[PDB]
Design a protein around this nucleic acid. Structure first.
Ligand SMILES: Nc1ncnc2c1ncn2[C@@H]1O[C@H](CSCC[C@H](N)C(=O)O)[C@@H](O)[C@H]1O
Ligand SMILES: [Zn+2]
Ligand SMILES: [Zn+2]
Ligand SMILES: [Zn+2]
Length: 431
DNA sequence: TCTTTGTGTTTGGTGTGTTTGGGTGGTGGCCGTTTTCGTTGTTTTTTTCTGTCTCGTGCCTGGTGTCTTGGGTGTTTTCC
């Protein structure tokens, strides 16, 4: 496996055993209202005489304070000293190591198998106010740092892990994380712990959801590798009307922040229903009402290819194919060929005219609207097609819809045109 | 295929209804003392109005999980 980088990671910052405070007023529980009647659990101390360990307030015990995310304090609770609900104070962190893989920096891995709901590691840092946070953020942006190191302890109170903190700062974002951050009360103070969402084995990376507020900062692309990745690091939108479809997909359709604003502003503010921000359900009316302009940028072509590889909706694919019909720039088409647009168009065909979630007349209109640019694009070799074998799909769909003779004749012309093109070499291999 | 429930009529009976005698409790008479009605005065407290800080209340957005519905079966209770 990857080489250990634990000491090298430790040397990059001032290691802390506990959270540091800018002042004694910050970080106090109940907004500084000292609960003199501290919540004392009614647990009886359970001392195992063999090991001398106080087993009270354990994981499978019925300690009320543990359920309510409050730690027992020695000398005040009936559970006695050294109970099993002093995890933050005793600093009983899980054993972890630091390593590096993929496009990520340093990352945290489990040195041992960790149970579900087990406390992993206490996020450490300096407790700071809002103005100090703004000053440090401006300084780091001037320094060009490309890493988040701020977490919101609570309203108006943040934790900075840049110069001083703990191993938890090296945990990387995952869109399907195995751990999560939670807020707990220890004495008259507030702590942020990290707990295991599931069973984690040795060697596996430990990750948590950042749910990051950008505060107007630019998006950063997410390289977590999870299948459910949204592609960028963020959280909830700063207001409604901000997105209706995912960016790459929205920009593939020619839509931008203004066009996504305009639809919601025209209907939602005038007593017509638009659901919350969720891309699992496509709103066909927005896609139909969207305006379409020809593509002349290769990054937009890459976004179109990503939308083809991602979106399953019939209407979004219809409007993307219509936009491609408007598009006539040869360089963008050559880029789409390099991106293997034929491969995506094969699946787009298959989902609509082999799988039947729609009506035959509308599918016929779709097929006539998608054969045209296939007929129009520049082609110079069958090796372009060989990366997709879309001809096979064309044969299957002309055979299925044999009653619709215009589609069959167009596919005849298309395969006749493609049959005459040249071929390119593949090195023979020993046998 | 196959068990219950009602009102009605002849005859019995036991408990409701009626009738005399008396004794005890309700009815008539007058006298005294005080409980309460009436008035008058004080003054406590209850209402009604004005101004600021405060903290909670109202509303809106996102969503986790608790509430509701369909299927099987078996074991628990029902019937003779
Ligand atoms: N899944 C991911 N893909 C890309 N960058 C990631 C990531 N998870 C974390 N990061 C990067 O790491 C930052 C958090 S700090 C994590 C430790 C740091 N990468 C280091 O090795 O020193 C994020 O702001 C981001 O820049
Ligand atoms: Zn306890
Ligand atoms: Zn305890
Ligand atoms: Zn991701």
């Amino acid at each position: 496996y990857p080489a250990d980088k634990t000491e090298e990671a430790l040397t990059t910052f001032k290691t802390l055993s506990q959270n540091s405070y800018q002042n004694k007023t910050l970080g106090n529980a109940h907004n500084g209202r000292s609960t003199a009647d501290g919540m004392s659990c009614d647990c009886e101390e359970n001392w195992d005489t063999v090991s001398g360990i106080n087993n009270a307030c354990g994981e499978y015990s019925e300690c009320i304070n543990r359920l309510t995310s409050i730690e027992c304090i020695s000398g005040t609770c009936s559970c006695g000293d050294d109970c099993q609900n002093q995890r933050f104070q005793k600093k009983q962190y899980a054993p972890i190591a630091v390593f590096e893989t993929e496009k990520k920096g340093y990352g945290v891995r489990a040195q041992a198998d960790i149970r579900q709901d087990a406390f992993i590691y206490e996020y450490l840092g300096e407790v700071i106010d809002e103005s100090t946070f703004r000053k440090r953020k401006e300084n780091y942006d001037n320094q060009g740092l490309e890493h988040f190191y701020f977490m919101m302890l609570q309203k108006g109170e943040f934790i900075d892990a840049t110069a001083k903190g703990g191993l938890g700062r090296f945990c990387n974002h995952s869109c399907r994380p195995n751990a999560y951050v939670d807020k707990w009360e220890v004495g008259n103070k507030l702590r942020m712990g990290i707990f295991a969402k599931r069973e984690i084995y040795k060697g596996e990376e430990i990750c948590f959801d950042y749910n990051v507020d950008r505060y107007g900062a630019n998006p950063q692309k997410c390289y977590c590798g999870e299948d459910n990745c949204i592609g960028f690091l963020g959280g909830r939108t700063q207001t409604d009307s901000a997105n209706i479809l995912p960016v790459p997909i929205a920009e593939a359709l020619g839509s931008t922040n203004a066009q996504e604003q305009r639809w919601v502003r025209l209907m939602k503010e005038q007593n017509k229903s638009i659901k919350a921000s969720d891309y699992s359900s496509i709103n066909e009316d927005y896609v139909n009402s969207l305006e379409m302009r020809p593509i002349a940028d290769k990054d937009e072509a890459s976004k179109v290819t990503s939308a083809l590889l991602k979106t399953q909706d019939y209407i979004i694919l219809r409007k993307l194919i219509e936009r491609v019909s408007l598009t006539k720039d040869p360089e963008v088409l050559k880029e789409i060929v390099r991106l293997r647009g034929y491969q995506c168009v094969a699946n787009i065909l298959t989902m609509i005219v082999l799988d039947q979630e729609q009506q035959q007349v509308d599918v016929e209109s779709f097929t006539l609207s998608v054969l045209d640019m296939l007929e129009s694009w520049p082609n110079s070799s069958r090796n372009r097609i060989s990366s997709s074998q879309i001809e096979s799909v064309l044969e299957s769909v002309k055979t299925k819809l044999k009653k619709i003779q215009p589609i069959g004749k167009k596919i005849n012309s298309l395969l006749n045109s493609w049959s005459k093109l040249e071929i390119s070499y593949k090195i023979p291999k020993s046998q």
